[PDB]
Amino acid sequence: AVVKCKPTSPGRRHVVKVVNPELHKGKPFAPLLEKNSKSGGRNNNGRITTRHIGGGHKQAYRIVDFKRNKDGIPAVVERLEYDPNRSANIALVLYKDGERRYILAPKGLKAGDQIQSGVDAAIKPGNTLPMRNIPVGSTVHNVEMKPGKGGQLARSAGTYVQIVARDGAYVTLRLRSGEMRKVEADCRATLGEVGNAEHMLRVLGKAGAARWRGVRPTVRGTAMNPVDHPHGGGEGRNFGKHPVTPWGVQTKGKKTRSNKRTDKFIVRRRS
Amino acid sequence: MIREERLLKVLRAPHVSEKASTAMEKSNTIVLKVAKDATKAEIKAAVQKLFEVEVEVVNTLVVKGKVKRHGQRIGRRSDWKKAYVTLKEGQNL
Amino acid sequence: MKRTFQPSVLKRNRSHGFRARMATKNGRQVLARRRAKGRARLTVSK
RNA sequence: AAAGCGGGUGAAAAGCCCGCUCGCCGGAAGACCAAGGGUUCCUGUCCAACGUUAAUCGGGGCAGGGUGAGUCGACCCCUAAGGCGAGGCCGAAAGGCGUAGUCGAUGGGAAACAGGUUAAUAUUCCUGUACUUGGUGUUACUGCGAAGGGGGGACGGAGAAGGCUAUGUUGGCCGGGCGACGGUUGUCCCGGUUUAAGCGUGUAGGCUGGUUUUCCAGGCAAAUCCGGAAAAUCAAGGCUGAGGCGUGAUGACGAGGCACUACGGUGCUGAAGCAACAAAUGCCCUGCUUCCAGGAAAAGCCUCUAAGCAUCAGGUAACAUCAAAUCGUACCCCAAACCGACACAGGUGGUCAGGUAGAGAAUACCAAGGCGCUUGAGAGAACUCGGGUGAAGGAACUAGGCAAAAUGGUGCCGUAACUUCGGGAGAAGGCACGCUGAUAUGUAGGUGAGGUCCCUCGCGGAUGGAGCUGAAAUCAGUCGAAGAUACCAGCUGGCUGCAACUGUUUAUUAAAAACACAGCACUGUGCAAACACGAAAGUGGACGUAUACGGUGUGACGCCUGCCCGG
RNA sequence: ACCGAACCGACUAAUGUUGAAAAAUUAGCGGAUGACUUGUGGCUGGGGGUGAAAGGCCAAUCAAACCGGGAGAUAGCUGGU
Ligand SMILES: [Mg+2]
Ligand SMILES: [Mg+2]
Ligand SMILES: [Mg+2]
Ligand SMILES: [Mg+2]
Ligand SMILES: [Mg+2]
Ligand SMILES: [Mg+2]
Ligand SMILES: [Mg+2]
Ligand SMILES: [Mg+2]
Ligand SMILES: [Mg+2]
Ligand SMILES: [Mg+2]
Ligand SMILES: [Mg+2]
Ligand SMILES: [Mg+2]
Ligand SMILES: [Mg+2]
Ligand SMILES: [Mg+2]
Ligand SMILES: [Mg+2]
Ligand SMILES: [Mg+2]
Ligand SMILES: [Mg+2]
Ligand SMILES: [Mg+2]
Ligand SMILES: [Mg+2]
Ligand SMILES: [Mg+2]
Ligand SMILES: [Mg+2]
Ligand SMILES: [Mg+2]
Ligand SMILES: [Mg+2]
Ligand SMILES: [Mg+2]
Ligand SMILES: [Mg+2]
Ligand SMILES: [Mg+2]
Ligand SMILES: [Mg+2]
Ligand SMILES: [Mg+2]
Ligand SMILES: [Mg+2]
Ligand SMILES: [Mg+2]
Ligand SMILES: [Mg+2]
Ligand SMILES: [Mg+2]
Ligand SMILES: [Mg+2]
Ligand SMILES: [Mg+2]
Ligand SMILES: [Mg+2]
Ligand SMILES: [Mg+2]
Ligand SMILES: [Mg+2]
Ligand SMILES: [Mg+2]
Ligand SMILES: [Mg+2]
Ligand SMILES: [Mg+2]
Ligand SMILES: [Mg+2]
Ligand SMILES: [Mg+2]
Ligand SMILES: [Mg+2]
Ligand SMILES: [Mg+2]
Ligand SMILES: [Mg+2]
Ligand SMILES: [Mg+2]
Ligand SMILES: [Mg+2]
Ligand SMILES: [Mg+2]
Ligand SMILES: [Mg+2]
Ligand SMILES: [Mg+2]
Ligand SMILES: [Mg+2]
Ligand SMILES: [Mg+2]
Ligand SMILES: [Mg+2]
Ligand SMILES: [Mg+2]
Ligand SMILES: [Mg+2]
Ligand SMILES: [Mg+2]
Ligand SMILES: [Mg+2]
């Protein structure tokens, strides 16, 4: 729920937090945890390639089943869990044959539910079907691009992908950007919007909260020196320049997509 | 088996000092200067077979060199090993 | 005041030691230069 | 931070040695280490040079001695970040990345304590009592086996309380004393009242339902193991665990007393060796409660089987024997030995943590212990430095209350505009405070013996209050100029610019109104993402997927954000 | 969040300025459960890194480190001859 903090300190005055009572409170599933080390935005040459990444809390990776390949076996949704690696919550689900998995939690799914994957599965949230079997007009998530590859679209909290057409071997999906994309009809997709929509209503309230999530501060080019940024310099506050990225490319309006390989699949841009 | 070649090479010299004499007259221990690459088993076998006595245990330590000056020319006296050999109450070298 | 030399034998040997000199190709050039000069001590190990 | 005197040695003593005083530190200026150094450690001798003076002295010269490990640390097994990297992908050459592997602690992994001894080492030597791992050989039973499956190792922040211990105080007991000057056989004074690891028992506390069948799309194949499903049956079963107690210990240690001394210290003997109370930041506790920011890996360990061996090997349990190699161990370590060219007001990580007053690791004085800072002696000018006090005035000084002075603690009474309803606020302002007696020969509260009762029977529960400790208050009296008496310890109020705030910044003249910020808007990006590092392969973005990521500008919040597309 | 030691820092004043010190001492001062601070180790390299942005920091050196080399650069300039 969206609960506002009382202003007993200047940092806590503006804080809005999302508290979920349905989440598990114990330790997560040790067979399915893994380590990941933080990079600080540094690649194998050691240089900062992505700025403003570093620090934050230590995290463990949860192996999440995006393929949803164990088809034909009914599964009992056991519990909902906090995954620190993504916006959405995960669900520990127990299959009928004794093997446990982590999945994304769709909206409305609760503890002790029924889900099932495969071509013969029913049309209800949490169930995974190929989009040749999924009826048109229906909202899905965790959508694949290639058959058997794994889910890649509508994976953050509260997002969904709407199937608008089916023309032969391809279906047209309207994506949360507003984008119409043709994808193969053999690709899998799980019904229902992803949960944790209230995730967008959070207010961090302080720079400390940002640093806990692991983002270093951002310095404006107009505050830099001329040698550092194309915007830097001036006595007082001077700009007089067209807005560019630190490497010199214009940053307000200039389109940067160039992929003639997938221009054939893109039907309409996000406008 | 440790060869007689090896034993006759590893035992170097006796050691004389106030502490060595006190060890001899108190704990039935002899103090031997020993070549550096000799181990405890080699020292024990060499003493036991050359001095015709019997050894309880042996304790080793490496004595470090000393930096000396000979007419404003710096030099370095070398290392050696020292062995405290304990005998079984009835040998009395 | 904290000065620039805070010594450590491990970091000294991993930085300027003989095995690091032989590990990099230009370190072997450094050893060639020092041997051709005739240094008593090539690297920091001795 | 501070010295004075007597004796000794010597050619010579302010500085060396010994003694008696005096002063300083005592969450350090004490004790032990890691890092770093390398003989500076101890003894004998010397005073050329070094020591900001002298030198008989030294961390100086010279010579000799000194560092003893199955249990401490390294080495070793195992991994993190990261390094190297057979083949490989890539690149004019050199080389870049990287799979299998293999290194890499700052982390995980078996085991020793007390007393004694040397001029210099000791958890290493000696005495006493223990513990661990591995190989061999007998005995008894037996399905053993991994590079594979499972469990475990295995993990955050904050908070709160209970139980304890280290430790301290007092009482009892034992040994000693009857005081240079009034009094001191007494409710008097000084000191001691220590004892470990290990082994046995398993308590406060914490966690979890056990036990037996049958079945299964899972755990890369198998599984008697893990998981899952269905039955039956029992209710206490298991795991963890400080402390206490017994033993170790008829032992050791012990104030002192007795005798030599090369007066430095040795040899002999040795009484009491308990209780109550207070109590940790240490232990139970890798716990419990709660929060969001969701909190290493692998081996050692336990367990299941494959291939294989199949009355063999192999495993478990007992006993005996053997082995545990090699390297460090001196000394300094908040410093005269490390980093600062110096015997340099600097810097340097962890461990221990006594008394009184105190909330306290502040502060004042002290204990254990260590020092008096390697030039002194005089004199008592100007002037400079660090302080103390000051008539009358009280900012008149000055750029400016800069500096100094002042305020300063606990309890209670009381407290405005404004406000985002939290604040402002400790607003402002005021009163009490010492000591003695009584309430009360020491109260409320805390702890709790003896005795009695009960029992699924002992480290058990109920009663019961001995004894110990002990606030706070009221009343009365009394002393001083003054009772938070020292040290320690807010100056307050009013109008206003800027930036919302906590923070960051020009190491070494600038701490700000600059930078950041949460929030806001625009814009790019459909994933082999945009973008960045890279001639490339690759990698970050991200093991993320438009409620996400990059770039740009503004900068909480409230009310708003108007017109212009000519350049 | 508040007051305040350890610890981190560096706002004001005096001293010092051939210093005790190539940046400190003394008396006050700010943070002190966090965007904290710290030990050991690793990574990023010079038109490059890193930068809560001061052209700051990269070994007492930074509007382009240090070391060797082209090199005896060049100098219509100064000094000396
Ligand atoms: Mg950014
Ligand atoms: Mg921003
Ligand atoms: Mg600027
Ligand atoms: Mg430019
Ligand atoms: Mg202007
Ligand atoms: Mg203009
Ligand atoms: Mg021994
Ligand atoms: Mg040794
Ligand atoms: Mg004298
Ligand atoms: Mg003196
Ligand atoms: Mg004296
Ligand atoms: Mg004192
Ligand atoms: Mg010497
Ligand atoms: Mg000495
Ligand atoms: Mg003389
Ligand atoms: Mg002299
Ligand atoms: Mg000497
Ligand atoms: Mg590696
Ligand atoms: Mg190769
Ligand atoms: Mg490589
Ligand atoms: Mg290894
Ligand atoms: Mg280690
Ligand atoms: Mg010593
Ligand atoms: Mg006690
Ligand atoms: Mg604490
Ligand atoms: Mg020592
Ligand atoms: Mg001195
Ligand atoms: Mg000093
Ligand atoms: Mg310190
Ligand atoms: Mg103090
Ligand atoms: Mg005077
Ligand atoms: Mg004066
Ligand atoms: Mg005064
Ligand atoms: Mg006056
Ligand atoms: Mg007056
Ligand atoms: Mg007045
Ligand atoms: Mg005037
Ligand atoms: Mg005036
Ligand atoms: Mg002032
Ligand atoms: Mg004052
Ligand atoms: Mg009273
Ligand atoms: Mg004005
Ligand atoms: Mg500000
Ligand atoms: Mg400055
Ligand atoms: Mg701005
Ligand atoms: Mg406008
Ligand atoms: Mg705070
Ligand atoms: Mg700073
Ligand atoms: Mg300043
Ligand atoms: Mg200060
Ligand atoms: Mg504050
Ligand atoms: Mg404070
Ligand atoms: Mg500028
Ligand atoms: Mg510098
Ligand atoms: Mg240049
Ligand atoms: Mg040329
Ligand atoms: Mg020239």
Curated annotation (Swiss-Prot), chain A:
Q: Which UniProt keywords apply?
A: Acetylation, Ribonucleoprotein, Ribosomal protein, RNA-binding, rRNA-binding
GO BP annotations listed: cytoplasmic translation; negative regulation of DNA-templated DNA replication initiation; ribosomal large subunit assembly
Bias (Low complexity) ranges: 38-47
Return the SMART domains for the record. Answer: Ribosomal_L2, Ribosomal_L2_C
Q: Where is this region: Disordered?
A: 27-52, 220-271
Matches recorded under Gene3D superfamilies: 2.30.30.30, Nucleic acid-binding proteins, Ribosomal protein L2, domain 3
Q: Domain of life of the organism in this record?
A: Bacteria
The record's family statement is: Belongs to the universal ribosomal protein uL2 family.
Subunit and partners: Part of the 50S ribosomal subunit. Forms a bridge to the 30S subunit in the 70S ribosome, contacting the 16S rRNA. Interacts weakly with S6 in one of the 3.5 A resolved structures. In pull-down experiments interacts with CedA.
Protein name as catalogued: Large ribosomal subunit protein uL2
UniProtKB/Swiss-Prot annotation, chain B:
Q: What molecular function terms (GO) are annotated for this protein?
A: rRNA binding; structural constituent of ribosome
What the entry lists under Pfam families is as follows: Ribosomal_L23
Q: Does the keyword Ribosomal protein apply?
A: yes
Name the SUPFAM superfamilies for this protein.
Answer: Ribosomal proteins S24e, L23 and L15e
Asked whether the UniProt record includes Signal among its keywords, one would answer: no
The record lists the membrane-crossing segments as none
The protein's UniProt keywords, in alphabetical order, are: Ribonucleoprotein, Ribosomal protein, RNA-binding, rRNA-binding
PROSITE patterns named among the record's database cross-references = RIBOSOMAL_L23
Q: Which cellular components does GO assign to this protein?
A: cytoplasm; cytosolic large ribosomal subunit
Which biological process terms from the Gene Ontology are attached to this UniProt entry?
A: cytoplasmic translation; ribosomal large subunit assembly
Family statement? Belongs to the universal ribosomal protein uL23 family.
User: What assembly does the database describe for this protein?
Assistant: Part of the 50S ribosomal subunit. Contacts protein L29 and trigger factor. Might also contact SecE and probably does contact SecG and SecY when the SecYEG translocation complex is docked with the ribosome.
Function summary: One of the early assembly proteins, it binds 23S rRNA; is essential for growth. One of the proteins that surround the polypeptide exit tunnel on the outside of the subunit. Acts as the docking site for trigger factor for Ffh binding to the ribosome (SRP54) and to nascent polypeptide chains.
* Protein known as: Large ribosomal subunit protein uL23
Q: Which organism is it from?
A: Escherichia coli (strain K12)
Its ancestry begins with: Bacteria, Pseudomonadati, Pseudomonadota, Gammaproteobacteria, Enterobacterales
Swiss-Prot record, chain C:
Does the record bear Ribosomal protein in its keywords? yes
Which is a Gene Ontology cellular component entry for this protein? cytosolic large ribosomal subunit
Provide the disulphide bond pattern: none
Q: Which residues cross the membrane?
A: none
What InterPro entries does this protein map onto? Answer: Ribosomal_bL34, Ribosomal_bL34_CS
Family of the protein in this entry: Belongs to the bacterial ribosomal protein bL34 family.
What is the protein named? Answer: Large ribosomal subunit protein bL34
